[PDB]
Amino acid sequence: EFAAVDLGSNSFHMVIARVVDGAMQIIGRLKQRVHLADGLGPDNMLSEEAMTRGLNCLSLFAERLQGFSPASVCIVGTHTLRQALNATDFLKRAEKVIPYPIEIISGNEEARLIFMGVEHTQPEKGRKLVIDIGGGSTELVIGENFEPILVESRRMGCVSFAQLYFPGGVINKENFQRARMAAAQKLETLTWQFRIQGWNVAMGASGTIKAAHEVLMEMGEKDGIITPERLEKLVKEVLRHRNFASLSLPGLSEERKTVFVPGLAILCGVFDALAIRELRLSDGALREGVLYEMEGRFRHQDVRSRTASSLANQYHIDSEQARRVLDTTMQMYEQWREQQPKLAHPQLEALLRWAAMLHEVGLNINHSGLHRHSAYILQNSDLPGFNQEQQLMMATLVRYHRKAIKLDDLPRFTLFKKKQFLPLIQLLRLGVLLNNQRQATTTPPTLTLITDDSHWTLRFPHDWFSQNALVLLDLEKEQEYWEGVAGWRLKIEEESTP
Amino acid sequence: EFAAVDLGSNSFHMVIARVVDGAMQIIGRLKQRVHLADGLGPDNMLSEEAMTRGLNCLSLFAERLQGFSPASVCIVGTHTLRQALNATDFLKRAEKVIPYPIEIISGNEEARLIFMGVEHTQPEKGRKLVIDIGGGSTELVIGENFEPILVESRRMGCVSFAQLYFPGGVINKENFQRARMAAAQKLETLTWQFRIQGWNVAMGASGTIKAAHEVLMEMGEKDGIITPERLEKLVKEVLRHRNFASLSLPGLSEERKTVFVPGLAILCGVFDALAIRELRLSDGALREGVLYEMEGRFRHQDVRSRTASSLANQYHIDSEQARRVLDTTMQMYEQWREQQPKLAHPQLEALLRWAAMLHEVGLNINHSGLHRHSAYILQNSDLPGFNQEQQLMMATLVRYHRKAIKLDDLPRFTLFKKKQFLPLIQLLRLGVLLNNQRQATTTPPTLTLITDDSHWTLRFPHDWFSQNALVLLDLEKEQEYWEGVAGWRLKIEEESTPEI
């Protein structure tokens, strides 16, 4: 029994499901019109009223989810929480009304998941184009057979476009055209690329496209296909009205009336830019993509594994070295975990494992400043399957893997605590250093790690450094590096005369 | 007549030559101890006394090069200038005693040129290992047929290791032992790779290795080869003495006595690390690499072209887009140039071209923040042929090619002035944006650029924007960007004359 929750701009959505004989099956769906993006202002601060509204919904969502284990639930946040400067404050307050962490995801991860949701709900063959127009952002993907090919997101949605192009809710040809051209403008750099890739079928998701389809059926269209001609009919109808408040289109809810016009403008902008001839509405979207992702992970299908393996190929990472560092780092990790079990968490363990595998990702840029270059790539790339904090954590572990360490600029995390991840930096630094000689590395048959808080002792075999003098110099340098970090101390020992 | 000069950490060097019927004819060579590296204090600030030694030598060099045009001289700076936090002060002071710009180059670039100098001087067949121990850095290169295969540089040299391991010039087994191991420690990551790669001959360059060779010959070794056994003989002779000041090995100058022991220690460490059996002395080194490069550049052969084409392959850059943006940018550049020709410079022209060609290098990191990611790769990668300022300038042009612009964040340059390079940023921003639609781009048949200092007017064909609405929106956003930059103004016009 799983649940996927999507904290969007216009609404918060939830889906609950189970798996029977390998097949997914929906138990319940929940939706509450929260208007999170409405509370977003000039300074990009969520208002106290919108935050109160959202907290009230998460308590209701937590009520429905009473008894669900953290593993059976995924809550994601999108455009509005990506742009809110006080996102952290909302997240922290949310902690007291819903016991599952909120995971902010990037626009390109959101687009990827929407595509997966459409693909899993709409299992119709062919290369698909997937469009999703939201309250704050718009996603566009071309893919086939659950494999994305092109993935994009743009900061345009019905809420933002309402304020920018329809001040006070005013409807006219000029306001509409400006909004439509603005939408095409945002797609300028991808039109040739998307059109030359092409698609067998185009599918549209979420509220704006759904309303467009419903108004068309109300206005006499014989089938549900959205076409350039039919969109022009919708525009003509819209322009018969002077304001969003008097937008009396058959089939529109009072709520949809506040955002339908800017949404339609973006939709027209999309069709204009990509020259879509036929678009059908999909019942799948983000929450379904999330639901299928979490389920695949219970079956040990984790796209992040593929992400890490593809990064290794893209950047020509020495796999033999990656594996040496991983083995060394994790041999020490198991001991650290053994001695401080309350601080060890499987999610951070996974991130440490990928950090070890990817610490040399920036080598093809330069060995000089390698930790900074590796961190640059990991922090700024598109990493399918990673949420924002996971991505930033992995980059952070890599950022501090060698040379002088001052933790002045350490990022804050809502999902991870310093007591849990600082020791992973210590472990990775030691794991890397011990493998400096690459293929010439002599690996000790045994290596004992003894921890007393952040005062660590590494005990090597009897007389080991007599044949590994350079390693000892590297360790003595690391001891000096740890002296800069308050609380950290490194001691090196060797087993005594037998 | 042309000359190559390098400002090292112990010696400054020069070579003067001329080309006769396809052949390089070396006219003369100069080596002068300056020991600039001794002036590097704990805060990495070059001392006044050291800067004065450097400037006095540059004055002498300038006089030697009287009548040489700037195109006929290339001066490069290595380790000491890379490390000096006040390098810019020294470079500004040098402007008054020698009229040629001093080009600081990376350790990697230095290593590459050293290998090139050995190859051009040692016309011998085979894959070569090249070791060069300077006063401040040590380079190790494996290459063949004038192409480097493995290129490395480490921060260890005969001047720097003197202070570090032999304080007060005190010589003893423990001090020597430490220096030798420290040199091996710096080679940790490259030994296996280098040893597997192998070489048909090992060549050594610069003063430390030349001194080791000269002392061995004076000791009676039958041939001039440096071997591990012979190095142990040198070490034993060295340890007989208590100080640099009393190092009476036959064949060492008083100047060489001050740095011979730490250099010897590094040499032993290199031999331990790479398992070298025989090291032959080469008389070619960095200055010869610079010299042969300058010569190729007269014949329009520039390794930077290969560097730019290699980056395009490495990062799968769209060549059609690169070409589109280059053409657009350079068509406006020629108009800019003709309106203020004094402000144009061949060097900066070449860097704008390459910036246009490589502005999308960071696309594999992300489509968003492209200007930042592209600049990051260009700023931090090894780019053969480029000096530090050229590399940073090229990366800077790319860094500012889109989005909000803030001139207060620009880096300083000794070689380029804002009046010469800010218009390159303006040209590139325009060239890129006019091609936003890629292959779907509509290229205007004409495009006139009119400049009034930094108030620029772009004049498009009659009625051009009626069929290119998105391009106008992009240009309007660019106009807004310039309105936030003092003195910069963008005006967009259409020719007013109707045509049939």
UniProtKB/Swiss-Prot annotation, chain A:
GO terms for cellular component: plasma membrane. It is an enzyme of class 3 (hydrolase). One of its GO terms (biological process) is polyphosphate catabolic process. It catalyses: [phosphate](n) + H2O = [phosphate](n-1) + phosphate + H(+). It is found in: Cell membrane. It is a peripheral membrane protein. GO terms for molecular function: exopolyphosphatase activity. Signal peptide: none annotated. Keywords: Cell membrane, Hydrolase, Magnesium, Membrane. It comes from the Bacteria. Its cofactor is Mg(2+). The keyword Chloroplast does not apply. Its EC number is 3.6.1.11. InterPro entries: ATPase_NBD, Exopolyphosphatase, GppA/Ppx_hydrolase, Ppx_GppA_C, Ppx_GppA_N, PyroPPase_GppA_Ppx. The keyword Oxidoreductase does not apply. Belongs to the GppA/Ppx family. Homodimer. Degradation of inorganic polyphosphates (polyP). Releases orthophosphate processively from the ends of the polyP chain. This is Exopolyphosphatase. It comes from Escherichia coli O157:H7.
